[PDB]
Enzyme design. Structure first.
Site, short mmCIF file in Angstrom:
data_model
loop_
_atom_site.label_atom_id
_atom_site.label_comp_id
_atom_site.label_asym_id
_atom_site.label_seq_id
_atom_site.Cartn_x
_atom_site.Cartn_y
_atom_site.Cartn_z
N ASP A 1 32.89 56.85 60.28
CA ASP A 1 33.27 56.75 59.19
C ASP A 1 34.64 55.74 59.53
O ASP A 1 34.06 55.23 60.27
CB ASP A 1 33.87 57.86 58.26
CG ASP A 1 35.47 58.54 59.30
OD1 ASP A 1 34.60 58.18 60.36
OD2 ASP A 1 36.09 59.63 59.68
C1 8Q1 Z 1 54.79 55.66 63.45
C2 8Q1 Z 1 55.89 55.45 61.82
C3 8Q1 Z 1 55.29 55.36 60.88
C4 8Q1 Z 1 53.84 57.17 60.61
C5 8Q1 Z 1 53.19 56.46 59.29
C6 8Q1 Z 1 52.01 58.00 59.18
C7 8Q1 Z 1 52.21 58.30 58.41
C8 8Q1 Z 1 51.07 58.69 57.19
C9 8Q1 Z 1 49.92 60.08 57.48
C10 8Q1 Z 1 49.70 60.06 56.08
C11 8Q1 Z 1 49.51 59.85 55.07
C12 8Q1 Z 1 48.01 59.78 54.28
O1 8Q1 Z 1 47.62 60.80 55.45
S1 8Q1 Z 1 47.27 59.13 52.50
C13 8Q1 Z 1 46.15 60.12 52.47
C14 8Q1 Z 1 45.24 59.43 50.93
N1 8Q1 Z 1 44.32 60.56 50.82
C15 8Q1 Z 1 42.90 59.10 50.09
O2 8Q1 Z 1 42.56 58.65 51.00
C16 8Q1 Z 1 41.83 60.11 49.83
C17 8Q1 Z 1 40.58 59.91 49.23
N2 8Q1 Z 1 39.61 59.07 50.43
C18 8Q1 Z 1 39.39 57.82 50.78
O3 8Q1 Z 1 39.72 56.66 49.85
C19 8Q1 Z 1 38.96 57.84 52.17
O4 8Q1 Z 1 38.15 58.96 52.25
C20 8Q1 Z 1 40.01 57.29 53.53
C21 8Q1 Z 1 40.78 58.44 53.38
C22 8Q1 Z 1 40.40 55.95 53.16
C23 8Q1 Z 1 38.59 57.11 54.66
O5 8Q1 Z 1 37.83 56.46 54.39
P1 8Q1 Z 1 36.68 56.25 54.99
O6 8Q1 Z 1 36.21 57.74 55.60
O7 8Q1 Z 1 35.35 55.69 53.71
O8 8Q1 Z 1 36.55 55.45 56.55
#
Ligand code: 8Q1
Ligand code: CDL
Ligand code: PLX
Ligand code: PEE
Ligand code: PEE
Lengths: 220, 459, 128, 67, 104, 88, 124, 175, 111, 178, 62
Positions: free
Chosen positions: F43
């Site tokens: 991915d």
């Molecule tokens: C160092 C101190 C800073 C720490 C910052 C980090 C902490 C934040 C961690 C949590 C934030 C999140 O997860 S925010 C989660 C956001 N929600 C979504 O993205 C749902 C829809 N899915 C998609 O868009 C794609 O599947 C995708 C996920 C892009 C994958 O891309 P590919 O599969 O096509 O490669």
């Protein structure tokens, strides 16, 4: 002058202990040493300040040369976080940097001892600002602190540099210059302090705890 | 001193009788010879001046100015032959005639023993300069500049004429020697105040004083390179020479009549130095630099001390040479790229290294690096001002910082960084331009070697 | 949850902290499309002359000319005497002069009064 | 002296640099030990610091609170 | 100009400008050799408070340590010849009152 | 002197070496032209991790707009070669 | 330090003031006091050009040390007896200064306590 | 040397101590001065001897110019331009000579400070006193005349000072 | 004539010689850095002698050799102070500079 | 730097960029390799927990909290590669990059050395001159009537064509020119 | 060819400097001023032959 030197040395020693660029650490160390020199001038000891200038030149220059050798070996990399374990990979550089760090911290009978030790024991015995004295002591602790930071992050542990290892310090020019400054940083303080006429009135009677203040604070 | 005046009047028909392709060579050679001849005036006494005749005399203050003028004429000739190549022969001869007439008027102005004759020549200098600016300038602003150059001068000088004749109906003489020996104090009355203003305002507007300086950016920007050279290096020093001459009859009124002008000079020196920090035009930056330096010279003349006069003389000489060099350096880039914007052609040190060295030396001299004569004049003026009042060291000190900034700013903007990609018409520097830079810069350090030649009569 | 970062003039707001870019609507996308179209048209117009083998000299940029003209020659025709303009001009052009005049006059009067009483210690003060 | 890259291995070390480093570290430690053996007073102090409270009133010349 | 994307193919890479786009009124103020308005890890109005507090605390501590000085339990240093009266400027025709140091 | 003149074969060897230390790809199944989403079933997060590993290995950063496009090891090698002026 | 804590936190009325010290007559407590002597002549110290701060009561040992230093120039480790003598003299000087400091503190505290006691006796 | 008069530029009798060795090791400074002597001082001496031999065959002389004393500005009528001119030039020459006198005294003072070493505060009191007297006289003579100075302004300053002193003396006699 | 002055002035004077040859056909070759390094090392070795003289006798001097200009009463001249501070700091600075220049021959090889 | 930008960034692109930035700053915090691997795996799990959100509003809201958390917990002094726009060698060699057209002004004595290089230069200049008319015509043909909408350029399609506007991309000075 | 550096860069400059200081600089007063040498008890003067007396019979706190 004394207050300016005290604030400068304390502030720069406090800034140095968290820097990740090695050149920045050495520059802040130079600024803190200049603050200590200003403190020495502020307590009416100009000749001690000049002696500290002469003794500081050696180990500061050779510490910078060791840092430059490390930078050149690791493809112009200056961050200590990507500098791994160079204790065995760079034996001569490690020896020179260790000797210079011990001289900078006033380890007894080295070049930095004969000026910094007297400077500290002279600010301890003077009618001076209390805050300036406290800041000088805290700064001379932070000096050992940031020297420990440099050594621990740059030479101990495991490698963190890119896998294409081009480390090579076998060049006669680098070795010869660093060796000359190493001999200086070992013997110049003794040679010079034993060959100048006494332009000070020495402090021969001090309480034992206060005579060992520099060693104690450096160890802590 | 006709041994200098007559050869210029002979430069005139030699230029007008020259073959069509030999005007520049003859003019430059004989102008250099005239400069070599005028070099003999530096042998001054310690007590009085060189009284050649009833009409002309030479002093330790006017001899360096005469040498600078006679040395500047050939430099203008070399700097002018590039952009006048396509001109017809008659118009080239007319341009050279304007330059020669300007030199003749300046030579006679700097040595006149009489104040009305000094006024006549110091006013006659306008016609060749105005003709040059409004005829051989490049853009349509030049016409307006000429008007700004003209009336600003005349509105200051016409009252002076009245005052001058008034003085001659009271003391019976305007000869400078008799005026000096028969000097009498000026009382404190309204008539004396207005006489002081009439005697001072012409030279204060020719400096130019802050607030009265608006003509200078126009005149020095729309003029051709030779016009800018002569306007900045010599024509601004007419005000200083005239004030140093005329102040002998204004005491002790100056003691309190200098306050508004001192305040204007100091604050406007700070203001113009600050203006130099935000300038999109490279020529305007040099013009405002000239304004700041001349404000310093105004302060030195106004506080009326021997150290101030020495520093003022040194500063006028050094500023003339330095500003002429800076204008020529800017004109080289302009001739290459046909634009005056500073951020247009960048990173020129990569393309023109020797030109970058010339730029570095000119900028280092502009910020008064020791032991250049710029620094000698500035430091003498600053010491005199400190004796005048200890608080001045604030404002002066401020200026010393700001100057350096903008000076290096210009360098860092024009020589360092990366070259502009779309500009590909930057040819290697010609021998003529390098020789122009060298002939500007070598006399500066040579005078640094022997600084008492430009320190004036108070030495 | 976490301490909030508030922007200033000299420390502006980051893009990733901007609420405006996290609630989008179609007209915003259209506006971004036209912005990119203008940028691309200007880029093409520049690059056509930039790569021309017969082009010698400077590529004239009307943006630079407009900027310099606005900074230099357009200012006076667009000036009106207003209470704000008049007050700011009077302040910034008159106040400093009178302030420095007062300071220097006070200092010199005090120095002269000290001189008249004969108590300033002007010994070794030869050069002035 | 030719030293080639290694790519994830320990770098090549010539005997000369190890000898130089060990020699200079040993000479530093020998100098410190020798100087401390001959100049201990420079670190431990040379003269005993007297305490004040064991000084009698006779040598300090203070009267017995009477006159 | 420091806030512009450094990875874009600018027409003027050092200036981070494109040919033909509007310049901005204060471009020479923002040339990135100069005033920078980029976001900071710590907020403005928080950096200022910490810096000012540090400076003021240091100044007030220095004043306090001035009016509460540190010293050693000793008397003043003694010099033989009337506090070296002739050595520090002389005036040997004034017979200054004698300073006497007594043993202890 | 300085670092040796990196070549295309060396770059390809290093990229394949780094990729063959990844636990999520089969070393036998991996080839120079194998696609990350199609052939290897990774991915976008795995592609970001691969780009970061390449950045660590060669010691220079790849911008996100350019890193989004590299999908096969040959593309990574080509980008590195064009970045470092390698022609042999 | 303890004297600093005593003066700044305790009763500063009975603590000596380094700037204004000594505050009692030199002959007050002692029946007679010997005048402290010097061994070096003024012309001798002037010829040696010691310092304005090195011309203290131990100047003769310093002069001898400098003379031996000059005489034994290449052997810069031979004048250890002379340096020891000078150091001992300065140590005795510092001991004398400490003795003066304690004499002043004791005189201050005893005088103030005796004054308080006499005032109390006269108040009853 | 006999180039300068030793009365105007005086110097102490220059007592130096004798070499009193105490160590058996050789003095490297002694061999260094011997090497410097034999290698530098002798060829320079030979070159100077040749130059002075050449100079001795061509001896010509230059003289100090003498100026008479003309009437001062006090003996000049109000509008007599010739006498005013001569008196003014004489005054300027005297002003220059006074400047050089102050220069000589200052050179003396600086040389004393460098020479006396660590005793300069006591061993150079006489030079400081001479400089104080000379500086006071010079300041009373020429200070505050400013640019455009002349003999007339100096005379006016002296007359003003004389009037002030006379008034002070006459009022003090009344006490 | 007291080699202190001659050696102290020669130490400074010989450092300006590569600056004078910067226009000659040694600045255009690859032997210039070694030339400058050797010049600085020779300067350090020469300056080691006045330090020995001071350590032996305590000799200090001032040398006012060139008179630049004189104002009315202030005289400006080219003068050098050769006391303990100068004769002590010059060899240290020259030693450090020699070491740094030898280091720079290796560090800036590709420049 | 090589690719033409788009009018905007997609949600997935923003998420990937935030993921890379968070990983790099966490590595800057965790100096040692094993600790970094541990916390990078933790961060990867934290990221892929909300990977399957069908509600775009809630996804962008989660991204908003992610950006706020990153800005609060970012490293004040993150590691930068030496040649990156914040590194210690970002523009170190730009002073050595000289444009090729400067060679057109060399004196014939200078051109007497390197004859074969200047022959190859003449061949390249001739190729560019021949190629230019075609490059312009192709750009004219392939452009939509309302001007270009992106900064992307077409490739060469004809038998012996060259990609339009290629001269200044091909003749870059170098990365280590001198 | 070997030791020509020590001749053209040390010997020639020191010859010029020594000549200039010996015959031109010291031809004027106060141009090269040397601080007075230190005199210690028991010393003898080179010119006058004067010996300096000893130091006042040390109390001998041995
Ligand atoms: C160092 C101190 C800073 C720490 C910052 C980090 C902490 C934040 C961690 C949590 C934030 C999140 O997860 S925010 C989660 C956001 N929600 C979504 O993205 C749902 C829809 N899915 C998609 O868009 C794609 O599947 C995708 C996920 C892009 C994958 O891309 P590919 O599969 O096509 O490669
Ligand atoms: C103390 C030093 C003594 C040196 C002895 C020899 C001195 C020779 C002086 C020659 C005359 C000046 C010439 C200036 C124009 C440049 C000519 C040129 O194009 O050369 C190219 C030529 C060939 O190079 P290239 O390959 O073409 O390179 C072109 C590229 O652009 C690459 O160019 P680049 O990167 O090489 O740039 C040139 C280079 C050098 O170029 C320059 O900058 C020249 C101008 C220097 C600044 C001048 C303004 C400051 C005021 C100083 C006034 C001093 C006047 C003294 C009398 C001089 C009479 C001419 O840049 C610098 O090195 C830095 C410049 C700033 C120096 C700052 C110095 C501060 C003051 C130092 C003391 C000054 C007073 C001394 C006395 C003090 C008390 C004892 O190179 C040379 O010939 C050498 C360069 C000159 C270096 C001299 C710098 C030190 C000398 C100071 C003044 C002279 C003092 C002499 C008496 C002793 C004192
Ligand atoms: C844009 C820049 C251009 C250059 C600026 C040039 C500056 C010129 C300013 C002139 C300096 C002073 C002028 C007059 C001297 C004193 C001024 C006055 O304020 O002082 C008092 C004067 O008192 C009152 O102020 C009366 C004068 C009031 C009327 C004057 C008009 C001022 C308005 C300012 C307008 C701006 C002028 C510039 C126009 C461009 C002193 O009291 P007094 O003792 O009694 O007068 C002395 C003369 N005595 C001895 C014969 C009696
Ligand atoms: C006599 C008192 C003078 C004190 C100074 C007063 C304030 C002076 C302000 C000068 C304004 C000049 C404006 C134009 C200068 C050019 C623009 C410029 O400098 O750019 C800023 C440039 C970029 O910043 P970087 O951090 O390096 O960024 C690198 C990463 N991108 O940095 C600078 O040069 C800033 C320097 C300005 C310093 C101003 C503050 C100084 C104040 C000093 C007061 C303390 C006095 C000391 C007391 C000592 C005790 C006796
Ligand atoms: C080249 C090698 C030459 C080899 C043969 C020469 C050997 C020695 C010859 C000696 C010549 C005679 C001589 O020098 O006499 C000194 C003679 C006259 O004495 P003045 O002090 O100048 O008189 C006062 C009026 N100015 O002065 C000279 O001409 C020589 C001056 C050389 C000085 C050395 C260079 C130092 C100056 C460099 C520039 C400095 C600028 C200003 C510095 C400011 C300092 C405050």
């Amino acid at each position: 002058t004394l207050c300016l030197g005290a604030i400068t040395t304390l502030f720069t020693a406090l800034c140095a202990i968290t820097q990740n660029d090695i050149k920045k650490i050495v520059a802040f160390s130079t600024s803190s040493q200049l603050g200590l020199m200003m403190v020495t001038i502020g307590i009416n000891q100009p000749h001690l300040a000049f002696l500290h200038i002469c003794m500081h030149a050696f180990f500061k220059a050779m510490l910078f040369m060791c840092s430059g050798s490390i930078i050149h070996s690791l493809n112009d990399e200056q961050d200590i976080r990507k500098m791994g374990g160079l204790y065995k990979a760079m034996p001569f550089t490690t020896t020179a940097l260790i000797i210079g760090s011990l001289a900078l911290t006033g380890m007894p009978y080295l070049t930095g001892f004969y000026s910094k030790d007297l400077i500290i024991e002279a600010v301890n015995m003077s009618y001076t600002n209390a805050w300036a004295l406290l800041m000088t002591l805290i700064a001379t602790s932070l000096t050992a602190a940031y020297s420990t930071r440099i050594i621990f992050f740059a030479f101990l542990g495991k490698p963190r540099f890119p896998p294409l290892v081009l480390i090579n310090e076998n060049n006669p020019l680098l070795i010869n210059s660093i060796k000359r400054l190493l001999i200086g940083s070992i013997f110049a303080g003794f040679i010079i302090s034993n060959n100048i006429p006494p332009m000070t009135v020495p402090n021969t009677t001090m309480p034992l705890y206060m005579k060992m203040t520099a060693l104690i604070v450096t160890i802590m | 001193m006709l041994k200098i005046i007559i050869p210029t009047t002979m430069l005139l028909p030699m230029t007008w009788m020259s073959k069509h392709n030999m005007i520049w060579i003859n003019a430059t050679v004989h102008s250099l010879l005239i400069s070599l001849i005028s070099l003999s005036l530096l042998n001054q006494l310690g007590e009085n001046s060189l009284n050649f005749s009833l009409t002309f005399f030479s002093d330790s203050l006017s001899a360096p100015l005469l040498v600078l003028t006679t040395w500047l004429l050939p430099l203008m000739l070399m700097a002018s032959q590039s952009h006048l190549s396509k001109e017809t022969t008659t118009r080239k001869k007319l341009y050279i005639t304007m330059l020669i007439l300007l030199q003749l008027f300046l030579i006679m102005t700097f040595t006149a023993t009489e104040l009305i004759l000094f006024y006549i020549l110091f006013e006659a200098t306008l016609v060749p300069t105005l003709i040059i600016i409004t005829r051989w300038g490049n853009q349509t602003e030049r016409l307006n500049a000429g008007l700004y150059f003209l009336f600003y001068t005349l509105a200051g000088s016409l009252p002076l004429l009245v005052a001058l004749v008034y003085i001659q109906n009271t003391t019976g003489s305007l000869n400078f020697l008799i005026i000096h020996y028969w000097s009498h104090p000026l009382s404190n009355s309204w008539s004396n105040i207005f006489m002081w203003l009439a005697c001072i305002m012409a030279f204060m507007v020719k400096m130019p004083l802050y607030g009265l300086h608006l003509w200078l950016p126009k005149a020095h920007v729309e003029a051709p390179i030779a016009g800018s050279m002569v306007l900045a290096a010599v024509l601004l020093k007419l005000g200083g020479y005239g004030m140093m001459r005329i102040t002998t009859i204004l005491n002790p009124l100056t003691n309190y009549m200098a306050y508004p002008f001192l305040m204007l000079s100091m604050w406007g020196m700070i203001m113009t130095s600050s203006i130099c920090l935000r300038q999109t035009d490279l020529k305007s930056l040099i013009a405002y630099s000239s304004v700041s330096h001349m404000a310093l010279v105004i302060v030195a003349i106004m506080i009326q001390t021997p150290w101030s006069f020495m520093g003022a003389t040194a500063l006028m000489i050094a500023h003339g040479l330095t500003s002429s060099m800076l204008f020529c350096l800017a004109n080289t880039n302009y001739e290459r790229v046909h634009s005056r914007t500073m951020i247009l052609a960048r990173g020129l040190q990569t393309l023109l290294p020797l030109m970058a060295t010339w730029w570095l030396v000119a900028s280092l001299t502009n910020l008064a690096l020791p032991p250049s004569i710029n620094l000698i004049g500035e430091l003498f003026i600053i010491t005199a001002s400190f004796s005048w009042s200890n608080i001045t060291i604030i404002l002066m000190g401020m200026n010393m910082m700001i100057t350096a900034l903008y000076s290096l700013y210009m360098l860092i903007t024009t020589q360092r960084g990366k070259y502009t990609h779309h500009i590909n018409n930057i040819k290697p520097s010609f021998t003529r331009e390098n020789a122009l830079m060298a002939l500007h810069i070598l006399p500066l350090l040579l005078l640094t070697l022997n600084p008492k030649m430009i320190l004036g009569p108070l030495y | 949850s976490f301490p909030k970062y508030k922007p200033s003039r000299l420390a502006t707001l980051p893009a990733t902290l901007d609420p405006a870019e996290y609630d989008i609507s179609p007209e915003t996308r259209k506006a971004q499309a036209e912005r990119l179209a203008i940028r691309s048209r200007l880029k093409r117009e520049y690059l056509l002359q930039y790569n021309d083998p017969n082009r010698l000299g400077v590529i004239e940029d009307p943006a630079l000319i407009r900027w310099t003209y606005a900074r230099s020659a357009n200012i006076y025709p667009n000036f009106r005497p207003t209470p704000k303009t008049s007050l700011l001009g009077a302040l910034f052009g008159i106040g400093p002069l009178f302030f420095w005049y007062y300071v220097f006059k006070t200092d010199r009067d005090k120095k002269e009064k000290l001189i008249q009483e004969g108590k300033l210690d002007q010994t070794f003060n030869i050069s002035y | 002296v030719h030293i080639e890259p290694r790519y994830r291995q320990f770098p090549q070390l010539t005997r000369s640099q190890l000898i130089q480093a060990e020699f200079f570290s040993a000479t530093m430690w020998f100098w410190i030990l020798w100087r401390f053996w001959h100049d201990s007073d420079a670190v431990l102090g040379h003269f005993p610091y007297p305490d004040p409270s064991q000084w009698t009133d006779e040598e300090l010349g203070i009267l017995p609170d009477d006159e | 100009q420091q806030e512009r994307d450094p990875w874009y193919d600018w027409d003027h890479p050092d200036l981070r400008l494109n040919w033909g786009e509007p310049i901005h009124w204060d471009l020479d103020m923002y040339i990135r050799n100069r005033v920078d308005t980029s976001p900071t890890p710590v907020s403005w109005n928080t950096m200022c408070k910490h810096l000012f507090g540090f400076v003021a605390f240091m100044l007030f501590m220095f004043w306090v340590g001035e009016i509460y000085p540190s010293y050693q339990p000793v008397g003043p240093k003694q010099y033989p010849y009337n506090d070296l009266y002739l050595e520090r400027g002389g005036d040997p025709t004034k017979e200054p009152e004698p300073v006497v140091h007594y043993e202890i | 002197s300085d670092a040796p003149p990196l070549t295309l074969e060396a770059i390809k060897d290093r990229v394949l070496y780094v990729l063959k230390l990844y636990d999520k790809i089969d070393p036998e199944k991996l080839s120079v032209n194998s696609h990350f989403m199609k052939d290897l079933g990774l991915d976008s997060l795995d592609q970001v991790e691969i780009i970061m590993a390449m950045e660590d290995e060669f010691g220079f950063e790849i911008p996100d707009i350019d890193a989004e496009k590299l999908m096969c090891p040959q593309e990574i090698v080509d980008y590195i070669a064009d970045k470092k002026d390698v022609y042999e | 330090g303890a004297h600093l804590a005593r003066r700044y936190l305790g009763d500063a009325s009975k603590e000596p003031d380094p700037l204004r010290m000594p505050t009692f007559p030199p002959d007050y407590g002692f029946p007679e006091r010997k005048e402290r002597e010097m061994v070096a002549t003024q012309q001798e110290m002037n010829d040696a050009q010691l310092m304005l701060q090195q011309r203290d009561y131990c100047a003769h040992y310093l002069i001898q040390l400098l003379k031996c230093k000059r005489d034994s120039f290449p052997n810069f480790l031979a004048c250890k007896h002379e340096q020891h003598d000078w150091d001992y003299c300065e140590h005795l000087d510092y001991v004398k200064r400490m003795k003066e400091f304690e004499r002043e503190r004791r005189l201050l505290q005893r005088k103030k306590r005796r004054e308080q006691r006499e005032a109390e006796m006269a108040r009853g | 040397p006999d180039s300068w008069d030793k009365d105007v530029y005086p110097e102490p009798p220059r007592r130096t101590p004798a070499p009193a060795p105490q160590t058996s090791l050789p003095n490297p400074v002694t061999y260094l001065t011997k090497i410097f002597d034999l290698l530098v001082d002798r060829p320079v001496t030979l070159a100077r001897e040749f130059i002075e031999q050449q100079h001795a065959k061509n001896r010509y002389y230059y003289y100090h110019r003498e100026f008479r004393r003309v009437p001062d500005i006090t003996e000049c009528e109000e509008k007599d331009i010739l006498c005013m001119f001569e008196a003014e030039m004489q005054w300027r020459r005297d002003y220059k000579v006074d400047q050089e006198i102050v220069n000589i005294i200052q050179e003396r003072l600086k040389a004393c400070q460098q020479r006396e070493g660590e005793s300069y505060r006591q061993n150079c009191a006489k030079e400081l006193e001479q400089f104080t007297q000379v500086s006071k006289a010079f300041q009373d003579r020429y200070s505050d005349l400013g640019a455009h100075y002349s003999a007339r302004k100096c005379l006016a300053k002296q007359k003003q000072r004389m009037l002030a002193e006379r008034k002070a003396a006459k009022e003090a006699a009344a006490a | 004539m007291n080699p202190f002055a001659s050696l102290t002035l020669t130490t400074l004077t010989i450092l300006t010689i590569p600056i004078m040859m910067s226009n000659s056909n040694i600045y255009k070759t690859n032997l210039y850095p070694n030339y400058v390094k050797t010049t600085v090392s020779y300067a350090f070795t020469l300056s080691l002698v006045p330090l020995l003289m001071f350590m032996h006798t305590g000799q200090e001097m001032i040398i006012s050799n060139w008179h630049w200009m004189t104002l009315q009463t202030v005289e400006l001249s080219l003068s050098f102070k050769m006391d303990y501070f100068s004769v002590m700091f010059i060899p240290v600075a020259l030693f450090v500079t020699w070491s740094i220049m030898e280091f720079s021959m290796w560090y800036m090889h590709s420049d | 730097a090589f690719s033409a930008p788009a009018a905007y960034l997609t949600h997935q692109q923003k998420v990937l960029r935030l993921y890379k930035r968070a990983l790099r700053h966490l590595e800057s915090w965790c100096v040692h390799r094993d600790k970094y691997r541990y916390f990078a795996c933790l961060m990867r799990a934290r990221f892929d927990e909300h990977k399957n959100e069908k509600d775009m509003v809630k996804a962008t809201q989660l991204l908003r909290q992610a950006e706020e958390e990153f800005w609060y917990g970012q490293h004040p002094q993150p590691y930068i590669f030496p040649e990156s726009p914040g590194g210690t060698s970002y523009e170190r060699y730009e002073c050595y990059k000289v444009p090729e057209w400067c060679l057109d002004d060399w004196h014939p004595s200078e051109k007497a050395m390197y004859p074969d290089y200047f022959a190859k230069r003449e061949q390249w200049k001739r190729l560019r001159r021949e190629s230019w008319e075609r490059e312009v015509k192709q750009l004219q043909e392939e452009t939509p009537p309302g001007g270009p909408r992106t900064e992307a350029l077409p490739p060469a399609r004809k038998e012996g064509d060259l990609p339009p506007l290629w001269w200044h991309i091909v003749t870059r000075p170098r990365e280590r020119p001198m | 060819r070997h030791s020509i550096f020590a001749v053209t860069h040390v010997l020639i400059p020191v010859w010029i400097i020594h000549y200039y200081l010996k015959y031109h600089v010291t031809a004027k007063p106060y141009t090269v001023v040397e601080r007075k040498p230190r005199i210690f008890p028991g010393d003898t003067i080179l010119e006058t032959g004067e010996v300096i007396p000893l130091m006042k019979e040390f109390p001998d706190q041995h």
